[PDB]
Write an enzyme that holds these catalytic residues in place. Structure first.
Site, PDB file in Angstrom:
ATOM      1  N   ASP A  85       5.910   7.475  10.264  1.00  0.00           N
ATOM      2  CA  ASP A  85       5.904   8.802   9.647  1.00  0.00           C
ATOM      3  C   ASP A  85       6.476   9.990  10.458  1.00  0.00           C
ATOM      4  O   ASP A  85       5.910  10.735  10.871  1.00  0.00           O
ATOM      5  CB  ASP A  85       4.818   9.066   8.966  1.00  0.00           C
ATOM      6  CG  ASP A  85       4.549   9.785   7.835  1.00  0.00           C
ATOM      7  OD1 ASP A  85       4.352   9.104   6.740  1.00  0.00           O
ATOM      8  OD2 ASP A  85       5.152  10.942   7.589  1.00  0.00           O
ATOM      9  N   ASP A 118       1.226  14.450  12.418  1.00  0.00           N
ATOM     10  CA  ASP A 118       0.250  13.600  11.817  1.00  0.00           C
ATOM     11  C   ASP A 118      -0.095  12.303  12.538  1.00  0.00           C
ATOM     12  O   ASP A 118       0.207  11.420  11.947  1.00  0.00           O
ATOM     13  CB  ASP A 118       1.056  13.585  10.584  1.00  0.00           C
ATOM     14  CG  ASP A 118      -0.123  13.002   9.344  1.00  0.00           C
ATOM     15  OD1 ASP A 118      -1.248  13.518   9.534  1.00  0.00           O
ATOM     16  OD2 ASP A 118       0.412  12.237   8.276  1.00  0.00           O
ATOM     17  N   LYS A 155      10.279   2.123   1.451  1.00  0.00           N
ATOM     18  CA  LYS A 155       9.684   3.305   0.933  1.00  0.00           C
ATOM     19  C   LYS A 155      10.174   4.119  -0.128  1.00  0.00           C
ATOM     20  O   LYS A 155      11.287   4.875   0.037  1.00  0.00           O
ATOM     21  CB  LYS A 155       9.282   4.348   2.177  1.00  0.00           C
ATOM     22  CG  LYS A 155       8.212   5.588   2.060  1.00  0.00           C
ATOM     23  CD  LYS A 155       8.713   6.426   3.130  1.00  0.00           C
ATOM     24  CE  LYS A 155       7.819   7.845   2.878  1.00  0.00           C
ATOM     25  NZ  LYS A 155       8.297   8.751   3.888  1.00  0.00           N
ATOM     26  N   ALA A 192      -3.435   5.267  10.994  1.00  0.00           N
ATOM     27  CA  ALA A 192      -2.748   4.626   9.846  1.00  0.00           C
ATOM     28  C   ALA A 192      -1.288   4.652  10.026  1.00  0.00           C
ATOM     29  O   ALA A 192      -0.329   4.082   9.443  1.00  0.00           O
ATOM     30  CB  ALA A 192      -3.007   5.471   8.637  1.00  0.00           C
ATOM     31  N   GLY A 232       0.845  -1.194  -0.147  1.00  0.00           N
ATOM     32  CA  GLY A 232       0.134  -0.089   0.139  1.00  0.00           C
ATOM     33  C   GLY A 232       0.807   1.282  -0.025  1.00  0.00           C
ATOM     34  O   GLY A 232       2.154   1.051   0.047  1.00  0.00           O
ATOM     35  N   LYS A 274      -2.247   9.601  13.557  1.00  0.00           N
ATOM     36  CA  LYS A 274      -3.484   8.914  12.987  1.00  0.00           C
ATOM     37  C   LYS A 274      -3.536   7.547  13.251  1.00  0.00           C
ATOM     38  O   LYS A 274      -1.863   7.014  13.227  1.00  0.00           O
ATOM     39  CB  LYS A 274      -3.789   9.536  11.560  1.00  0.00           C
ATOM     40  CG  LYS A 274      -2.660   9.344  10.556  1.00  0.00           C
ATOM     41  CD  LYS A 274      -3.027   9.790   9.295  1.00  0.00           C
ATOM     42  CE  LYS A 274      -2.283   9.588   8.272  1.00  0.00           C
ATOM     43  NZ  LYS A 274      -2.847   9.754   6.761  1.00  0.00           N
TER      44      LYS A 274
HETATM   45  C1  LIG Z   1       7.790   6.764   6.789  1.00  0.00           C
HETATM   46  C2  LIG Z   1       7.328   5.260   6.948  1.00  0.00           C
HETATM   47  N1  LIG Z   1       6.833   4.672   5.869  1.00  0.00           N
HETATM   48  C3  LIG Z   1       6.419   3.537   6.248  1.00  0.00           C
HETATM   49  C4  LIG Z   1       6.678   2.909   7.581  1.00  0.00           C
HETATM   50  C5  LIG Z   1       6.276   1.427   7.510  1.00  0.00           C
HETATM   51  N2  LIG Z   1       5.039   1.013   6.887  1.00  0.00           N
HETATM   52  C6  LIG Z   1       4.694  -0.196   7.112  1.00  0.00           C
HETATM   53  C7  LIG Z   1       3.547  -0.600   6.201  1.00  0.00           C
HETATM   54  O1  LIG Z   1       2.829   0.267   5.803  1.00  0.00           O
HETATM   55  C8  LIG Z   1       1.576   0.041   5.281  1.00  0.00           C
HETATM   56  C9  LIG Z   1       0.506  -0.166   6.306  1.00  0.00           C
HETATM   57  C10 LIG Z   1       1.132   0.579   3.875  1.00  0.00           C
HETATM   58  C11 LIG Z   1       1.342  -0.878   4.122  1.00  0.00           C
HETATM   59  N3  LIG Z   1       3.153  -1.875   6.550  1.00  0.00           N
HETATM   60  C12 LIG Z   1       3.900  -2.970   7.273  1.00  0.00           C
HETATM   61  N4  LIG Z   1       3.384  -4.050   7.194  1.00  0.00           N
HETATM   62  C13 LIG Z   1       2.079  -4.571   6.554  1.00  0.00           C
HETATM   63  C14 LIG Z   1       1.433  -4.017   5.691  1.00  0.00           C
HETATM   64  N5  LIG Z   1       0.217  -4.671   5.575  1.00  0.00           N
HETATM   65  N6  LIG Z   1       0.340  -5.733   6.154  1.00  0.00           N
HETATM   66  C15 LIG Z   1      -0.636  -6.887   6.298  1.00  0.00           C
HETATM   67  C16 LIG Z   1      -1.083  -7.357   7.902  1.00  0.00           C
HETATM   68  C17 LIG Z   1      -1.118  -8.844   7.001  1.00  0.00           C
HETATM   69  C18 LIG Z   1      -0.067  -8.295   6.050  1.00  0.00           C
HETATM   70  C19 LIG Z   1      -2.334  -9.442   6.943  1.00  0.00           C
HETATM   71  N7  LIG Z   1      -2.098 -10.353   7.894  1.00  0.00           N
HETATM   72  C20 LIG Z   1      -2.100 -11.562   7.564  1.00  0.00           C
HETATM   73  C21 LIG Z   1      -0.539  -9.991   8.161  1.00  0.00           C
HETATM   74  C22 LIG Z   1       1.674  -5.865   6.904  1.00  0.00           C
HETATM   75  N8  LIG Z   1       5.036  -2.493   7.688  1.00  0.00           N
HETATM   76  C23 LIG Z   1       5.570  -1.338   7.600  1.00  0.00           C
HETATM   77  C24 LIG Z   1       6.631  -0.843   8.179  1.00  0.00           C
HETATM   78  C25 LIG Z   1       7.162   0.506   8.352  1.00  0.00           C
HETATM   79  F1  LIG Z   1       8.219   0.655   8.917  1.00  0.00           F
HETATM   80  C26 LIG Z   1       7.322   3.630   8.264  1.00  0.00           C
HETATM   81  N9  LIG Z   1       7.525   5.101   8.194  1.00  0.00           N
END
Ligand SMILES: Cc1ncc(-c2nc3c(OC4(C)CC4)nc(Nc4cnn(C5CC6(C5)CN(C)C6)c4)nc3cc2F)cn1
Length: 267
Positions: free
Chosen positions: A144, A126, A44, A130, A27, A128
């Protein structure tokens, strides 16, 4: 930090796969899944002035309730096995609902994260659901730091509208605005409802506070039905903290150290 090179990260993301899973994209710049030796990473792929602060904050700030930056060249992070609080609250991709007990741990940990930032003289700007990510154990980790700032005003108003304090929508930069945003987050934790939904009445979640105050409804009427372990006493105790956070007069809001205290007393 590990100083990476743009070619390595392309292959780990498999030519930066901008597609779901049914690719690498998780995402949204944009965030794709990856691996470094054994370490699962979220990369990122990104504004230039925002990148400078993200590294500045991640070098000064290290806490269990903050996310960890591994690499930079394209910021690289320890993948969060349970994604964001927003997605877990909405049960995105079929994940089961968070129990009251898990939600308390999340609130508590997120407040600890904010307290560490405020302790190190930083404003998130920010906060939130999310930006509240969850590890393998569902420990809350604040993310973030691009718009973070070390009373002061700006002509370039930034953030997420549904979470922003009134004085923050007027330009003010105060740590008390982060407290307001945290109060919106506490409301999502209680209700399981997103801060804003265009196909909802009221569209804004922080408006339910007014409905409760004017006795049109109760907090009991708004508790997330997707839980079986919530007790009225601790739910009312989190709403009371949320209410205090959401005071329209910035100096009538509690500080993060007191928010942190009220959450501990709750458990
Ligand atoms: C500036 C900045 N930018 C981004 C980060 C950062 N972002 C994410 C992140 O961002 C998002 C939410 C957009 C995707 N996602 C994830 N992991 C994840 C994402 N989705 N899933 C799902 C959960 C399951 C898969 C379903 N279930 C079975 C397991 C895991 N780790 C992250 C780790 C980070 F450091 C930090 N700082």
């Amino acid at each position: 930090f590990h100083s990476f090179s743009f070619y390595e990260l392309k292959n780990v993301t498999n030519n930066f796969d901008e597609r779901p899973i049914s690719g690498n994209k998780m995402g949204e710049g944009v965030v794709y899944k990856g691996y470094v030796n054994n370490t699962t990473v979220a990369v990122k792929k990104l504004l230039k002035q925002q990148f400078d602060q993200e590294i500045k904050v991640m070098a000064k700030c290290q806490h269990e309730n903050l996310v960890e930056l591994l690499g930079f060249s394209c910021l690289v992070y320890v993948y969060m096995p349970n994604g964001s609080l927003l997605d877990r609250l909405s049960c995105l991709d079929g994940t089961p609902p968070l129990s009251w007990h898990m939600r308390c741990k999340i609130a508590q940990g997120a407040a600890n994260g904010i307290n560490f930032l405020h302790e190190n003289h930083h404003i998130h700007r920010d906060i939130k659901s999310a930006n509240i990510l969850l590890d393998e154990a569902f420990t809350a980790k604040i993310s973030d730091f691009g718009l973070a700032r070390a009373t002061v005003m700006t002509s370039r108003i930034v953030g997420t509208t549904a979470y922003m304090a009134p004085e923050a929508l007027r330009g003010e930069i105060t740590p008390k605005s982060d407290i307001y945003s945290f109060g919106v987050v506490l409301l999502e934790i209680i209700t399981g409802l997103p801060a804003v939904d265009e196909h909802r009445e009221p569209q804004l979640l922080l408006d339910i506070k007014e409905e409760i105050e004017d006795e049109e409804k109760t907090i009991e009427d708004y508790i997330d039905k997707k839980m079986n372990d919530a007790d009225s006493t601790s739910v009312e105790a989190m709403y009371s903290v949320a209410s205090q956070c959401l005071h329209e007069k910035k100096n009538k809001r509690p500080d993060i150290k007191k928010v942190q205290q009220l959450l501990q007393e709750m458990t």
